[PDB]
Amino acid sequence: DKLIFAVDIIRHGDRTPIVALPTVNYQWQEGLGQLTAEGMQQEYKMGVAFRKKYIEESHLLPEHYEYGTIYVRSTDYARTLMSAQSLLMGLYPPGTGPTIPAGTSALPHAFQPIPVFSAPSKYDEVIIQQVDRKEREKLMEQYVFSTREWQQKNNELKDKYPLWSRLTGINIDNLGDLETVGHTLYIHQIHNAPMPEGLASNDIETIINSAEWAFMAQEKPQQIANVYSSKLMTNIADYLNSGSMKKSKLKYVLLSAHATTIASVLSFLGAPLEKSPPYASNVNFSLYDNGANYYTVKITYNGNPVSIPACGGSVCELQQLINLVH
Amino acid sequence: DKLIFAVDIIRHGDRTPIVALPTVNYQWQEGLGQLTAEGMQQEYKMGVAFRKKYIEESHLLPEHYEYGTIYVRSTDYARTLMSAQSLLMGLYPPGTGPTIPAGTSALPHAFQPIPVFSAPSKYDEVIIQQVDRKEREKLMEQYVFSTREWQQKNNELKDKYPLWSRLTGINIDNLGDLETVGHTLYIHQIHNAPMPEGLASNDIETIINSAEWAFMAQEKPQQIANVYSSKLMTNIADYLNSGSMKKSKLKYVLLSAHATTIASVLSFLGAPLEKSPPYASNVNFSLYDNGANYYTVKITYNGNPVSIPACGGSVCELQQLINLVHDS
Numbered sequence A: 001d002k003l004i005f006a007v008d009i010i011r012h013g014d015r016t017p018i019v020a021l022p023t024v025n026y027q028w029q030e031g032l033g034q035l036t037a038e039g040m041q042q043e044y045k046m047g048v049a050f051r052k053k054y055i056e057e058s059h060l061l062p063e064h065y066e067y068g069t070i071y072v073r074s075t076d077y078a079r080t081l082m083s084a085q086s087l088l089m090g091l092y093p094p095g096t097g098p099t100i101p102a103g104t105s106a107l108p109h110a111f112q113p114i115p116v117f118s119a120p121s122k123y124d125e126v127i128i129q130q131v132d133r134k135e136r137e138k139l140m141e142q143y144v145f146s147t148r149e150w151q152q153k154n155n156e157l158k159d160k161y162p163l164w165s166r167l168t169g170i171n172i173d174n175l176g177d178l179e180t181v182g183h184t185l186y187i188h189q190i191h192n193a194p195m196p197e198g199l200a201s202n203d204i205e206t207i208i209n210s211a212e213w214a215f216m217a218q219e220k221p222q223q224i225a226n227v228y229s230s231k232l233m234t235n236i237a238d239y240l241n242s243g244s245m246k247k248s249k250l251k252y253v254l255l256s257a258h259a260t261t262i263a264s265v266l267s268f269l270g271a272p273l274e275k276s277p278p279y280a281s282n283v284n285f286s287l288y289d290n291g292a293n294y295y296t297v298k299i300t301y302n303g304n305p306v307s308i309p310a311c312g313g314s315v316c317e318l319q320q321l322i323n324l325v326h
Numbered sequence B: 001d002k003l004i005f006a007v008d009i010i011r012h013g014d015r016t017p018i019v020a021l022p023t024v025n026y027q028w029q030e031g032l033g034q035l036t037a038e039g040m041q042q043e044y045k046m047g048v049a050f051r052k053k054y055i056e057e058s059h060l061l062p063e064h065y066e067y068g069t070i071y072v073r074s075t076d077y078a079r080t081l082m083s084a085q086s087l088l089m090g091l092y093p094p095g096t097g098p099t100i101p102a103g104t105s106a107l108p109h110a111f112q113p114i115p116v117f118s119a120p121s122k123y124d125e126v127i128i129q130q131v132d133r134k135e136r137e138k139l140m141e142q143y144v145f146s147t148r149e150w151q152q153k154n155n156e157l158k159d160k161y162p163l164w165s166r167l168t169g170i171n172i173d174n175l176g177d178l179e180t181v182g183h184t185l186y187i188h189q190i191h192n193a194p195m196p197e198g199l200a201s202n203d204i205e206t207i208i209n210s211a212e213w214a215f216m217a218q219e220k221p222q223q224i225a226n227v228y229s230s231k232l233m234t235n236i237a238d239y240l241n242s243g244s245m246k247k248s249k250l251k252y253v254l255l256s257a258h259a260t261t262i263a264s265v266l267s268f269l270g271a272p273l274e275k276s277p278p279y280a281s282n283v284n285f286s287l288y289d290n291g292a293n294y295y296t297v298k299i300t301y302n303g304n305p306v307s308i309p310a311c312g313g314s315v316c317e318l319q320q321l322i323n324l325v326h327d328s
């Protein structure tokens, strides 16, 4: 069994919060929504593991970056572009960069430039499907807000939304409003950033564990995942199909996505996540040739086999995967 | 007189041809139209120059990379993307990059990741204005192919187009077919790549110089420059207008464009070029604060004062330049 193509959806590394809490004065040094140094090392080390897997152990890619062989597309965010640059620095590190005729390295420490292509979210033909605000609310009310367990979570904390709106500073009427706050509190935890004064230790975990839950409840439904990840899955499907033909120089596609991208894909494959994708997460698609024209795709999420119902496990036949997309 | 904002448009570094010559057994290792080791080095050197100007001498930007202060935008190409990456290694070099709490560098050699934002040509609200090759033909037909200089040049050369077609292995029917050929031969010259056997040195030099000439003749007419450069120039005027207000952290915009971008921007401003911008060329807008709400914008090409007729010189007043842009 030979590795003849691979697709990596990754998440960006450790980041600053999107919103500041209006009752905490905390200057985030890196800015809002920005890759932290920790995040740069998280992605770099996932790059080294990729090097070991794709170049040392398999030979799927050469030792030094070659034209035609890899494609890297990011979303229209600083943090995914910078996560992508960090990771490729691990995949093709300094020492492997090109050199001028005379013989000395073209860039300091012989770093290797690799292009990270990208499009605005509204013009993205590869990763992101735009969906109108009004139409997501239509979907969200139908497949999620509707559900027994959404209702019951809301109902458990349908009275502390007053106390938390005051202490948080950003007002909370329903669980959806709570998601955005809990994620910011989670990041405050990781970086030892100050919490809203008066907010109980016990209430912190609640808002965090509730924010994760609610975020994941909105990816779980396959109907949602189909609207949001069809384009992306049609594209990965086609990449793998063209990989199987063994004509094209192209062996590897790296997509610099986020948590939603990863959770929407797995939910699409009928393996929705209970837990949030960590920083530096990857869904991986490995195309194997058995030498007898039996093309298999092994899908893994942070190293663990994903079990696709439509394939009865982590191994899909190539056409089984294309069918499941269609 | 303090510098408070700047915009650089750059051409990428040294590259391989777009089109190999089918009559030459020579293989470009980087791929077609890709950035070379020399080109990376050229873009890096300009980063050092930019660091010295914008960080050491000027204090426009800080010593270590700081959120919200720079915006880097590239066209939808490996060469422009890899050029910015390279330049940015000069502007914020290894040793200046972030450090984890344990205190080791977060990337090897303390490298400074800087995001290069981008859009495909047909989705690009900043740099490139998309013109279907149909509408380009009416512009050329109206403003370029109608000029006697264009038709004289073509008449001088067309008798040799059959011979050049065979020898280069590229179909040459008109002066514009010859432009790609001439660019490829120039690139062969730079890299000592072998020439098509029989193709006379005199003819090699005519084909190159005539290719350059037809290239710039297509960028020359201001009316052409208004179609391609209005959007990019409304954006550059807007970045500059924001800078005068001094509310934003933003101080520096890097646009990783190509020769067409540089030639078309100067043409838009009434200072069309005679000669193709060399690799790692730049056009620079520097916003100056006279100290009492009088903003000037000094415009240079490769460090040299561009003389804009509407401004009577290389220096415009900020609103005079915004009006010049709006005029189109």
Ligand SMILES: Nc1ncnc2c1ncn2[C@@H]1O[C@H](COP(=O)(O)O)[C@@H](O)[C@H]1O
Residues within 6 Å of the ligand: A011, A012, A015, A018, A179, A180, A182, A183, A186, A211, A212, A215, A257, A258, A259, A260, A276
């Ligand atoms: N741990 C989490 N808890 C709650 N929401 C999350 C979490 N991780 C990601 N999200 C959601 O995913 C969005 C984009 O994630 P990302 O760009 O990967 O940081 C965030 O704005 C949240 O809405």
Ligand SMILES: Nc1ncnc2c1ncn2[C@@H]1O[C@H](COP(=O)(O)O)[C@@H](O)[C@H]1O
Residues within 6 Å of the ligand: B011, B012, B015, B018, B179, B180, B182, B183, B186, B208, B211, B212, B215, B257, B258, B259, B260, B276, B277
């Ligand atoms: N010396 C030259 N001779 C002919 N065309 C040129 C020359 N320099 C630049 N160009 C044109 O500019 C196009 C794109 O510029 P760039 O991407 O900067 O190399 C080329 O494909 C040519 O049409």
